[PDB]
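go over my protein:
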Amino acid sequence: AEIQWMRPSKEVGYPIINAPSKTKLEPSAFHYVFEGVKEPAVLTKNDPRLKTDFEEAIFSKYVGNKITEVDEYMKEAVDHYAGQLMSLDINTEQMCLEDAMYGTDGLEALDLSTSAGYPYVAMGKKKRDILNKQTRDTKEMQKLLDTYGINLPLVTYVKDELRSKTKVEQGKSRLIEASSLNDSVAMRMAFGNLYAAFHKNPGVITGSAVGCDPDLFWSKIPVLMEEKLFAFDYTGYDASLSPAWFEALKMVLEKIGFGDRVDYIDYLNHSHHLYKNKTYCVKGGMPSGCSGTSIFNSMINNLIIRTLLLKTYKGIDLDHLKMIAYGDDVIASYPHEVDASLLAQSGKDYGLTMTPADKSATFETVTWENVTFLKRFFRADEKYPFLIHPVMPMKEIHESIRWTKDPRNTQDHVRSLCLLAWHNGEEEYNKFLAKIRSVPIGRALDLPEYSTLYDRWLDSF
């Protein structure tokens, strides 16, 4: 993606946006009980750890667009994917403001904790001041729509999250481009049924994993995959999507019944931003905080993988391409072996930066033994092999448990980690519970034992 221009918000009539400067993260009761190397990302220029201009580093993700034209391959990719989706019979109807707000089957209600973006972020108005979960009141929202309309600037914040030492010293913090509650609502009405259809059909038909429950879904993946697996990582996926990938996305939407509101896709692609006191225009790239971001990123990944295969392996049978994406992350397969390294080359022509799966030195064969999806490995249950365990590495869990954003959610944070950890084995799990219980805070938590989680799991199928 590329910033077209940038200048003082006041110059163009926009109020300054004040974003916190102090991280809400801090050592937790288990900070010294477990090993960890990650710490809060840099949130301001005045951060002792910085080793380069912050402002300069957070915007270094923008380096241009290598392409701006949907070629022949991309068009064929569009047709094949669009064709697959056609078989789901996605409801092309628009979603009523009520369901678009408080949810329906296939779509959760709006996240009240997340920013309501402009103009409500400099208007001091929050989300609970516009909707009530038990009321189902559209009235307020409706007036707000009619008043400010849509296509409002995206409020840009630095993301408060753990980052390695390096990325802290190089001010490599990630940015949250929050959308106005107005747009988010419009888009859920425009694509609401598309979203639901995807959430209800994680797999190789939607080629999506969004909405999935790893505890159950992991056992279905091997059955959906073809003989030979292949994968790779992306560097700066969102920012790397050229405008052409958005046009191809629109072509797909048009072909499945949504040519109706494809303009919305233009706002994702060519976006208007508000960061601090400045305002800027971005051409290309996916914004991190818009309605559907996850789903559209996955749809585009399906288009991407297909395109690179058509350009590298003419005559390939896409109908035997079995892949599942979740944003940039993907697990794919084909009846025959393919060269990820080659594919990584073709992708470079399309602006994509593909590298060896899970930071490997080079492109090695991908197997059920080493493949990962959503950071989770795949391990057959030692007693009932047909049941597959999604195995998140302890290191991730250790890193995460060493901090906290609110003592009141400690019970939940630790419980959640437990639902991830036990898949590593009873031995490992008990060592984990043991260390948690080696401090006062831990001992006061209500945590599930191994046999309890293993039995619940077996019955859930």
